């Protein structure tokens, strides 16, 4: 589709048949079709996790402007006490995610081989793409046209960049992400990465 840099010719292996294809591959990671097949799924999963992470880091902090709830900032939520110890929660999360990710992994190797429920054999997911399961995972039956996939990928890339910014800003500033925006909005021409 569009060009990430006008005046430069798109690589041949990027034929534009994929959603969100702008011909951006200066270092040639996706020359091998198997590598491209793996990296598409990797990007999809990374973005889908990153958007949720950013939503969970930003929104539970914007409460200060509204004063509705009281929750510690994203880097202090770990130290708080909970009804169960860290070890038990970590073990349960490991046990569940092992099964979930092993089930997801098998579809990349042999598509259409994990479409049937293992206990109740009369329940199955309708056939679809590798990274787009559908069925019960799409309860509202929104049509997955190419435009929506491009929107999803753009939002995922933006959220990856946002999470990287969130991580980097806290390391050097020592505060959360929302107050950094307010500090910049206070005096824009003096509060930047150049402190002076």
């Amino acid at each position: 589709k569009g060009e990430w840099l006008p005046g430069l010719a798109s690589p041949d292996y990027l034929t534009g048949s994929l959603a969100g294809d702008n011909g951006f591959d200066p270092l040639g990671l996706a020359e091998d079709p198997e590598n491209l097949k793996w990296f598409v799924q990797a990007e999809l999963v990374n973005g889908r996790w990153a958007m949720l992470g950013v939503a969970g880091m930003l929104l539970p902090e914007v409460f200060t402007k509204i004063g509705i709830i009281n929750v510690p900032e994203w880097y202090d939520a770990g130290k708080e006490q909970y009804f169960a110890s860290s070890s038990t929660l970590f073990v349960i999360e490991f046990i569940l995610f092992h099964y979930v990710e092993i089930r997801r992994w098998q579809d990349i190797k042999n598509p259409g081989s994990v479409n049937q429920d293992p206990i109740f054999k009369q329940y199955s997911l309708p056939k679809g793409e590798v990274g787009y399961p559908g069925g019960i995972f799409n309860p509202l039956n929104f049509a997955p046209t190419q435009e929506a996939k491009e929107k999803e990928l753009a939002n995922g890339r933006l959220a990856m960049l946002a999470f990287l910014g969130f991580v980097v800003q806290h390391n050097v500033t020592g505060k959360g992400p929302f107050e950094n925006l307010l500090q910049h909005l206070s005096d824009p021409w003096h509060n930047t990465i150049v402190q002076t």
């Binding site: 200066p26 270092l27 040639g28 990671l29 091998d32 198997e34 590598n35 793996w38």
Partner: protein, 152 residues
């Protein structure tokens, strides 16, 4: 106290070594006027020696019976900066260099006279290849998985 060693900041021999070096440096200073340039150089050397000893004291090194720092390379988390991290950095840099060299060698293998491109470097091709080595681990791992790394 691994293997009977002691911290640098608690070692008396370390302070004795620092005092001896400072005293040796200060002896030559008395031969020159305070405003003379050699006096400034000697003052800078003394300040650098003091700063080096203070920095060695701050980093939590271990001293032996002779007042000299010793390096632990067994993998203890308290001493991961002596061997582990610089080793990983060196491995990354060496892999970058090797991958760049291998890619350049492979690229020119199909030319009519490949031996001519080895003594007279094709600068644009090398420059286009140089930046590619920044992600060498991923490329190497995927090449190994696809069976391309080893010649048949």
């Amino acid at each position: 106290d691994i293997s009977g060693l002691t911290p640098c900041k608690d070692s008396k021999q370390f302070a004795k070594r620092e005092k001896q070096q400072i005293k040796k440096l200060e002896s030559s200073l008395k031969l020159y006027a305070p405003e003379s340039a050699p006096a400034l150089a000697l003052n800078a050397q003394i300040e650098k020696t003091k700063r080096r000893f203070d920095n060695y004291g701050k980093y939590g090194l271990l001293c032996g019976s002779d007042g000299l720092p010793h390096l632990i390379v067994n993998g203890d988390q308290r001493h991961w900066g002596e061997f582990i991290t610089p080793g990983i950095l060196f491995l990354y840099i060496a892999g970058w260099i090797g991958w760049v060299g291998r890619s350049y060698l492979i690229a020119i293998s199909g030319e009519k006279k490949p031996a001519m491109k080895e003594i007279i470097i094709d600068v644009p091709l090398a420059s286009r290849i140089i930046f590619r080595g920044f992600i060498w681990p991923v490329a190497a791992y995927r090449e190994f998985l696809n069976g391309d790394l080893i010649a048949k």
